[PDB]
Amino acid sequence: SEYQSPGVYVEEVQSGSKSVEGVSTSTAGFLGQTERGPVEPRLVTNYADFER
Amino acid sequence: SEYQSPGVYVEEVQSGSKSVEGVSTSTAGFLGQTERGPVEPRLVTNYADFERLYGASPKSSDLDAAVDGFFKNGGSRCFIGRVSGADIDDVATGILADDEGNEIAEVEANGPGQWGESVAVIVEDSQYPNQFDITVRYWSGDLEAVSKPHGDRPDPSPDVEEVYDGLSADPEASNFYEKQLESSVLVDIEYKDDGTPVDGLTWLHRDVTLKDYEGVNKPGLRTGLAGFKAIDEISMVCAPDENDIDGLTDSIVAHCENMGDRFAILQSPQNPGPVSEMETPVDSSYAAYYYPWVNVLDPVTNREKLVPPGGHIAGIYSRTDQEHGVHKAPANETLRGIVGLQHNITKGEQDVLNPKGINCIRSFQGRGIRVWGARTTSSDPEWKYLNVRRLFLFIEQSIQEGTQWAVFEPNEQDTWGRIRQSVTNFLRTVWRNGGLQGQSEDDAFYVKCGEETMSEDDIDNGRLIVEIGVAPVKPAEFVIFRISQDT
Amino acid sequence: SEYQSPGVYVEEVQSGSKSVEGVSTSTAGFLGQTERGPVEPRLVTNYADFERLYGASPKSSDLDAAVDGFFKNGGSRCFIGRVSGADIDDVATGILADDEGNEIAEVEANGPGQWGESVAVIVEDSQYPNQFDITVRYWSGDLEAVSKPHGDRPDPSPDVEEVYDGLSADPEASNFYEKQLESSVLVDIEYKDDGTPVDGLTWLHRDVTLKDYEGVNKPGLRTGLAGFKAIDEISMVCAPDENDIDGLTDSIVAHCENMGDRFAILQSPQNPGPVSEMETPVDSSYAAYYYPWVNVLDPVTNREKLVPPGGHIAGIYSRTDQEHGVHKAPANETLRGIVGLQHNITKGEQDVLNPKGINCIRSFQGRGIRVWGARTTSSDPEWKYLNVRRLFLFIEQSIQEGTQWAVFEPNEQDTWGRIRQSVTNFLRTVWRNGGLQGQSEDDAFYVKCGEETMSEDDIDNGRLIVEIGVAPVKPAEFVIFRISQDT
């Protein structure tokens, strides 16, 4: 920082380690023919959602 | 001191430590449209104050609902700033006349808009010599249906009523009408000439974009965000209608990042799209993002209505700060004042939304409706959690405001010890209340000021350097139980 | 000293080191068209100051947008220079008259152009003996629609208003009107004869190329770049409309190379052609080149508008300098105050643009819009990175300005030790703040002054030679992870 006029200054510093987080690993993708529905990919979490 | 003539001298010395005091942390700021009121920011501590000073919102705004949700959830103090599409000087005015027809006073509405056309001023005479009474009345509905506006009981009872009894025309008295009518939510009086007014009734006559939310910045007038940036009590800002005005989210986040001492609360759109494609609007460490909308009872139709959840969430923030501290995550808390949600989110959909910085409001069977998520919109791993940012804001503002005695003091060991002692006392207090983590003081923080932080080039140029290290506490987001049969 | 009569003598000696102080590094300079204002460069520290002194830009300029983007991104100080297509002496004037018709004062607009035809001056009398009031009003729109320019409330409220109350006609008093009206953004007053003016209103009557951007250079008047080259605070220069005026890019780069203490920021055209054929305009080490254009909200139509990114980038420079230092690359930083970009650049296209010195502004999913690139337009391998050039500018100007005490001093070992000590202290301070690289002082820098740098022919001719060697730090542009299964 630069100090040109008198006063109080408060500054933040970077710390000594940054955490890494693991990614998801149990999602699947399926392709095939259906009778209804959109053609953009959509997320489903249950079989009743799929039938609906 | 200097001693040139004999006598007794008594001198005061500075002590070895100076106390630091913590700052307020539960005040909020709101922006939006109203029907009445001034356009400078005003402090409100209760919902009846809000209805008395401002009134209701038009059909294109949801401010009234947000303030109601704020106070139903345990909030303490609001700063209200009224945004208006009319020019600031488009105000209704009037004139008071004397015995033989001289204008002696000038009456002006307390804010711009057409509402001022429905204010009536009534002057009558008092039973005591040289005294008179003044009354101000306001109707919210049609004027064509008001039968007896001057009588003791008008046909529709007026919406606002004000009476002032012991008035005089002596400028040096304490019952001069200019000084007594100064506390009035409807009108303003200015003195012109000597006299006393004649009895009767009189009406006041001859009466949004992103640039209105930005506000006016002139030497003697500030509205919008320019008015808020001159108030140092506000700690969180919200605009309920931020999704109807393009370019307001960025302005709010920039305001909070440029002040450096407040936090921004953001809500999703009513239709944000498919779940697999949602993102946050900004990538700031000074903002948080909540989803979905909520349902309330509307006090003019008595039906359900869908509104954004911002004010209820700000009220939850204020409540948690009052009963737990700024280090407590404002999640796993109940929402009061609503009827239902827009959608019910499952556990499979939150596994996609939570790693993206989007906070969810969910409903559990047997437990109710709660906020489930406490992250910021930031990508930096150092500012992932919300309470850490709030704690740092609190600490940094306290330090900034409570150390102005040290400027221009001698740059030597006494000042160094004094500063070190003060900051250590403040941080030990923060540690004792559960904000810092560690079984000893050495684990929780340290403060340094001396010849390890300053060199000689520093002393020759007037720099005093203090280094502080701290360890904040973080929430428990995943509670895991690993159970086996061994031993 | 010489001692010829007996007594006591007290003499002062010079010490063993003299401190060097660093210079400012976050001030910018802007050039372009405005509607009002003077044509000499003026310092601005806030956007409301800019609107108050200058106003808005015409349809052929984008200065207002660039200054707004500068201050929305954390900039601190601007120097504004107004470029005008009208002659400098094409200014509106007026006259004030006394009791029996003598011209006592002369009023003149604060800048050339037709705007001065819309300024009204009003003189009225005060309640105290020998005193009067003066008011100055300015309307931005049509004059044909102004109903009561003299009344207390004109039909359209004026755009600018100034009032001065306690004025006198005594030249030796401190409330003489010539001294009080001197701080006014609209007019200028000059005294002619003895008297006091009569009441009433009066209007002021009888009112670009590359050579206007170059500016006037006369003994008592400087505009354009000639005005900027007499200000030593500016550290970076930008002209938003540099692509509409042919021959201005070279003039700006030549100005920065001839001063030797400032940096030039350049933006691409709106249509630069095919990607495989792009080049930089110049090959200077004193310039940087950014691409593409950005989208903003226009405060007069409330629609999107496409503008060059120069002022936002200068604001990013200033912010980074304030919070990190001049050794930090101003890349991987967020742009505030915009809506979108012109194009989205992929990773395949930047592999062609980056080795050519062209810096890109990109948008990442989950992270936002950021500047991705920190190179200069230079072909020399020694000045490839931007922060190295900025650090050298800072160091060299500090040394130049903080060593003028050493001229004409004795050329012997005491002066040598003193100079060496000062420069070593300054460089050690720079090293401690992270600007130089090395685990020890011998790795980071050295300073030499003595009989290894100077010979006897040097001493006989008056030359004192100091040799300094330094090692700057460079950014991490490619982060590489090589992972294997062994051990």
- Radius of gyration of chain A equals 26 Å
| Extended strand count of chain A | 0
Largest interface: B-C, 27 and 26 residues
Order of helices and strands of chain A: H
Number of helices of chain A: 1
Task: Kindly describe this structure.
- This is part of a larger assembly, with 3 copies of chain A.
- The first copy, chain A, is largely without helices or strands.
- In chain A, 10% of the residues lie in helices and 0% in strands.
- Chain A has 1 helix and no strands.
- The longest helix of chain A is centred in the C-terminal third of the chain and has 5 residues.
- In chain A, 0% of the residues are buried.
- Chains in contact: A-B, A-C, B-C.
- Chains B, C: InterPro entries: Phage_sheath_subtilisin, Tail_sheath_C, Tail_sheath_structural.
List keywords for this structure.
52 residues, 3 chains, part of a larger assembly, elongated, structural protein, little secondary structure
Please outline the helices and strands.
This is part of a larger assembly, with three copies of chain A.
Chain A: H1 47-51
The gist of it:
The structure is cut from a larger assembly and holds 3 copies of chain A. The first copy, chain A, has 52 residues and is largely without helices or strands.
